[PDB]
């Protein structure tokens, strides 16, 4: 940690308390688990499982989910202790600002500004696949159905439309309902269980026999791909102002949501590859494709509808997590403060959701899903590594702190989170480093020409 102006935890309580003073707190460990599951299950399991099975691991994609799941478990425990120690309405940016400080907080924040954005484009691309697949059986123009390659398509229009629709939704700001959230999440969980219950009757173990055709090398490169599917448990700390006793219900919501998805993910990979041979799984809607391939067409409509109504929740959470990140970074002074009128004569701090949304809408319509997922994955992995180290830093500096939940084993588990994650980063392409490093160099320039012009310069 270089050039550290740590934010005092007392100051984070005052901001999370002033913003959440009018809000009614009544959420529990179940509502927070719905907030986690509703932000995890999406394009990663519904779409990326097909490409990862076909071209990375094969039937051994279950080991890819176990290795990738193990990395997220160790990292989720670190996020949990931060949510238990710093129970503020903030994520890895607010945690790094209190443990490392300014420079590390800005790099991670600048890293997350992109990670939430590229993931928003990635979630919408997979959403466009299931929406188009559900329509056929109809089809739009052939030139407006995917990214721009050498033969076929120009722009992904459905992915563009759903982004501008969620941008229109977040602009209105309909008061989110805790009961409405549990319904949409249960739709997602039931159709995943519906696939597993129906699909188990059609599993031929012959489709498992070439278990590791690409070897463990392909198991590892697939683990970095479906690592995308586990992201979302960090969104539990969003409603930190609306929880009675956040010190213990937020760690519960984080871990319980992740472990539930891990079991469902391990189950889907085994059934999906057991039904369809892995070579035929490279398709935009593998779960709906698996039900069609095996003559269960009527159920493939249910799963396609639950995916349409379920993936659209991950997109709402992702773009909000990016919008709220602009609100917090500019509040800390590291970005220019924008303002707009909320009443005819009362102006408030403003973040242009139509510009951040239009930027997401562009990339969702021209970039293929495998690239957006990989670029999202390098951003999430570095943010995961920083938090896993920050726990050990917060253990050494400020040890006598209130920790309702604390990581099981003091050094071993956070170190394992770092090694597991850092091993996954090595299995990503080198071109993913191009857009990621050059993005950090742009932010590193911003910090040394404007970052030291903030609410903590003095």
């Amino acid at each position: 940690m270089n050039l550290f102006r740590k934010k005092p935890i007392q100051l984070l309580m005052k901001e999370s308390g002033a913003k959440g003073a009018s809000l009614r707190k009544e959420l529990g460990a179940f509502d927070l688990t719905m907030l986690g599951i509703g932000a995890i299950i999406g394009t990663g399991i519904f779409v990326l499982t097909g490409v990862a099975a076909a071209e990375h691991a094969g039937p051994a994609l279950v080991l890819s989910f176990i290795l990738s799941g193990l990395a997220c478990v160790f990292a989720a425990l670190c996020y949990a202790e931060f949510a238990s120690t710093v129970p503020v309405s903030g994520s890895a940016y607010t945690y790094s600002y209190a443990t490392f400080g300014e420079l590390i907080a800005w790099i991670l924040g600048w890293d997350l500004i992109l990670e939430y954005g590229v993931a928003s484009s990635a979630v919408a691309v997979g959403w466009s696949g299931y929406f188009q697949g559900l329509l056929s059986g109809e089809l739009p123009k052939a030139l407006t159905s995917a990214y721009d390659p050498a033969k076929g398509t120009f722009i992904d229009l459905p992915a563009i439309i759903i982004v501008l629709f969620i941008t229109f939704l977040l602009n209105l700001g309909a008061k989110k309902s805790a009961r409405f959230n549990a319904v949409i999440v249960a739709i997602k969980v039931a159709v995943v269980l519906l696939f597993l219950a129906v699909g188990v009757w059609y599993v031929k173990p012959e489709n498992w026999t070439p278990f590791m055709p690409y070897g463990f090398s392909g198991v590892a490169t697939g683990a970095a791909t479906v690592f995308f599917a586990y992201i979302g448990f960090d969104a539990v700390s969003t409603a930190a102002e609306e929880v009675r006793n956040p010190q213990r219900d937020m760690p519960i919501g984080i871990i319980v949501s992740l472990l539930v998805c891990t079991l469902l993910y391990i189950a889907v990979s085994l059934v999906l590859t057991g039904i369809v041979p892995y070579e035929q799984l490279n398709v935009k809607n593998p779960v709906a494709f698996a039900l069609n391939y095996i003559h269960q067409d009527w159920v493939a409509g249910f799963i396609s509808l639950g995916a349409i109504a379920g993936i659209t929740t991950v997109l709402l959470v992702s773009m909000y997590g990016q919008t709220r990140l602009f609100y917090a970074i500019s509040r800390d002074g590291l970005l220019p403060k924008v303002f707009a009128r909320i009443s005819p004569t009362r102006q408030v701090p403003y973040v242009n959701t139509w510009l951040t949304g239009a930027a997401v809408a562009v990339f969702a319509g021209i970039i293929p899903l495998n690239k957006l997922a990989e670029l999202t994955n390098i951003g999430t992995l570095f943010a995961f590594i920083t938090v896993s180290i920050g726990v050990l830093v917060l253990r050494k500096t400020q040890p006598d702190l209130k920790r309702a939940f604390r990581v099981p084993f003091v050094p071993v588990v956070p170190i394992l989170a770092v090694l597991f994650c850092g091993y996954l980063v090595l299995q990503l392409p080198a071109m993913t480093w191009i857009g990621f490093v050059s993005w950090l160099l742009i932010g590193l320039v911003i910090y040394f020409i404007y970052g030291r012009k903030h609410s903590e310069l003095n």
Partner: peptide, 27 residues
């Protein structure tokens, strides 16, 4: 958290009931 646990289990069973129903009338 109280009543929301029921609305979760309800529509979960409603979807699985209709899903189990459609899967029986196929192939």
């Amino acid at each position: 958290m109280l009543g929301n646990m029921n609305v979760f289990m309800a529509v979960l069973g409603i979807i699985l009931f209709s899903g189990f129903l459609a899967a029986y009338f196929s192939h």
